[model samples]
Target: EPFKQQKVEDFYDIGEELGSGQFAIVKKCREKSTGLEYAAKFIKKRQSRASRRGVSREEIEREVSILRQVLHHNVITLHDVYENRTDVVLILELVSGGELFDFLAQKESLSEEEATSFIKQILDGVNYLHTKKIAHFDLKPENIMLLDKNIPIPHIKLIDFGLAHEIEDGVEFKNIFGTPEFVAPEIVNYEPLGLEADMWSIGVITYILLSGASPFLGDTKQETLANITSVSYDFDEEFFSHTSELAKDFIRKLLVKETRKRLTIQEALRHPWITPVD
Candidate 1:
């Protein structure tokens, strides 16, 4: 391990629980030496029988490996790792501005400029990941967050690499890992997935950010998956009437069913909607 694997108590002064999930519990902690605040995620070494047999071990290793290799301003930074007999602890950057959904839900709508700014930051991070042969399988609003509260714009950070995978040359990822609402058609059909899948989720996220409505969400998970499979979506005039055609064009280029036809990160960044027109 590149980081020190020491007793958790020796390094951090653990504080209140930040959040909890089925597999892990995140808590606020402060480094004793540096006095820096961070979020410490604890994962049980011995999980339920089903979890032990599942990909939990491999996923945790992969997440740590990928995070250690990549460093970007827009991606969450993994500080250190500590292990005990019962659990493994991951010290991560403390993000304060909250989830992107919470930030968006407070507002009725985002202007083209504001939405473009957020999307550009997200694409920048994803583009960096693709360059490193890493694919963030999950790119929904919940995984995107703000660095801190700032005026005008709060720098966005992409988090939750639990579902992320590293791609090898000439190799393809076939696992069905992602949120139902933002999943690509390739994922639904068990087809080969690559960076294009992330782009598709970005399209969904952009749609929601601009209009505050889900593009492919349905009454049930089954219906949502079906909606994604058919690429069934419409820009209701009631919501998108004032939105620029350029923005819709950007989403259209990414939401293409054919992976090859979908816009690449570079192309998306260069799109007129995000690019400056001086």
Candidate 2:
């Protein structure tokens, strides 16, 4: 029911390509009547049930279903969904501002306070999803978008919900997914992952935001995974020289190897860096 069995080009005039991926292509589109702008994501559906190349119909349904459930300020809005023979076109809210750090890179200066403001938005968005037991398996910076970089502390639109799953109590779900650099210890070890995984990513994101350096990065992916699994990282003075102790504590708590010990969205939202000390 999420996809309307109609042609997307019938009502909207699709324009130049805005962004792309292996199986998805985002194009700029505008409504013929209202002239309002929107992004049309044309995702190539799997050719058949046995294929592993394009997106599966079930996966597309899951994505749209999750998007339809919530209305949050920090998340992208779904305008409409149209389905054709080869692909499904999702008309989503248009976000001109680029990725998180790319938008921040244009600024003359960045501060801990400023970075906290951005992370707060990311937490709030993910917090809304976690409340419904929806885990955004992929929470890297590449998926975080800015509405308009011109505005101070641009709005964060959490994208790429293709790997997101609704964790049902009593139903055990395990899978090896998500970007390696920001994944939690459980992800690397291929254990049952939950909302806490996103918290780990948010920690890495915070670490990078404040310092412009990755904490567990190595020369090779294998080395990075080794570092992550062993929980090997520190607040090196070379990068974190000006970072506050409160910020360091915030990252430390979320980066814990034990999922139970990691910070929750609620707790991280209240961290001193986010919600000032008494």
Candidate 3:
């Protein structure tokens, strides 16, 4: 079941593969009906023999259910979904460029203006997600998509919500999901997580976006978890020397160890780094 693939030519003419991950493959495709290009995310049904952490098809449907309710320009919009015996096909908005991490891989860092603009757009989109009560448990540069070549800062679209779930009333979601590097302190500890965890990831992304590196990263995943829990790190001069003080201040507010101190979406949008129109 895992190796199976399905084509949705009526909606999309599948092209070459863009990337592949544990759960899905992203492909560049053109919408058959509209003629607009798009990315199609194909998820393989979990084989009965290959067991995971109690995750099931309903969980996948839950994610899609939540995603279908959202209507925002800032967030990546899902056009449609269909399931067969083999896999679930998601017709999505295809962003032409590449991942944000590619920027760091090519250029070690970002100019102040470039970082500012990109970060602002991210906050705007993320805030919109918060308003909808949808949390992107995993938020990292690797999940960001560049949209235009002519833009200096790069237009981005957040992708991949396979791990995202509706926020249950209970805490400690009982799911250890998310890229280790981008997880928040509360999530690392298995405490009841809320939107704040998402905020923490945003802070991490902001640091990496400007510095071209992680501020709270450790030599190992455990070390990183410890550092995230302790909320301890030295903002070496190299990371912030080229960045604005306001930007640094905003990041500090989000990177706090205490969840309450973490900047909410509202507060972050109002922060100087993002608030003042460029």
Candidate 4:
């Protein structure tokens, strides 16, 4: 291991894998000096024929560089990164509480006050990312981390910058990435997506977090995509009878048909449902 040869591992111990995927594995680890726990994300270079032809390693490197530079309370903090001929290692802060989806699923449904607080925090985090010129293309529930409820208001940190990038003035990303249910209409239309795209995802996330069901989901992927493209779906009153009008209105403002007209993160944060009461 590079860290071992470099003698950094002497302070830290590598244990069992925390999570694994096609391109990487997250392991439970700690910093020897501070004894702070972390999730070591190991990204392997080995790629299938299809991936080799489709994805860019340079983009992955770019993401690593971006994460390393980004330092914010609402953003996942990266301790260090090392790369070699075989793989790349990203030491990320330990978020043991699990995904927000799991937390929300455990509840029958979220009350407007609860959902409002979470949505507000999410928008604030996303707006902060935008200020940093970083676009987190993926903003699904699985990427959200919840604290022990003891932490302050902005307790969650947005994780997984794998699909994040710096959107240049004239450049656009048409990679067709992100969870289908949370994707923006521009993403489905293959149009140039911007920060507004993230808000659309916020709408999907808020809807699911409050109702426990995805607004755009269908029996088939094609049907779901079509609904997403056409902004076709219903938020039945039976599901949201107890939900506040402002909360639904907030979601409607975000899930707009045109990307240009979609609600901005700052604007969303100011909505009645998301606005923090003094």
Best by TM-score: 2
Tens-digit lDDT track for model 2 on 1-278?
65788998888999999988767799999998899999999989988867766788778888889888867888888989999988899999998778988888777778888888989889899999999889888988899998887776688888877788887888877788777788888888988878888899998998888888888888898999999999999898998888889889999999899888888999998888898867
Candidate 2 Cα errors over 4 Å, as ranges: none
Error of 3 at 60 (Å): 1.3
Tell me the lDDT of candidate 2.
0.87
lDDT on C-alpha atoms for all candidate structures: 0.86, 0.87, 0.75, 0.76
Winner by lDDT between candidate 4 and candidate 2: 2
Task: State the lDDT at 270 in candidate 1.
Answer: 90
Question: What TM-score, over all chains together, does every model reach?
Answer: 0.94, 0.96, 0.87, 0.89
Looking at model 4, residue 262 earns an lDDT score of 82
- For candidate 1, give the lDDT of residue 66: 91
Clash pairs (backbone) in predicted model 2: none
Clashing pairs in 4: 11-32
Please write out the lDDT profile of model 4 over residues 62-126, one tens digit for every residue: 77877876787777888876565456677888776677667666666456887677777787778
* Evaluation by lDDT, superior candidate among 3 and 4: 4
What does candidate 1's lDDT look like per residue over 1-278, in tens digits?
64466788898999999986646789999999999999998876655566542236677788889988889999999988987756678999999889877876777757799889889999899989999988899888888999885656888999888888998978766978677888899999999988888999989989988877888899999899888888899999988989989999998898889999999998899999999765
Which residue pairs in model 3 clash with each other? 172-192
Give the C-alpha miss distance for residue 76 in model 1, angstroms. 0.6
- For model 3, the local distance difference test gives 0.75
Clash number by candidate, in order: 0, 0, 1, 1
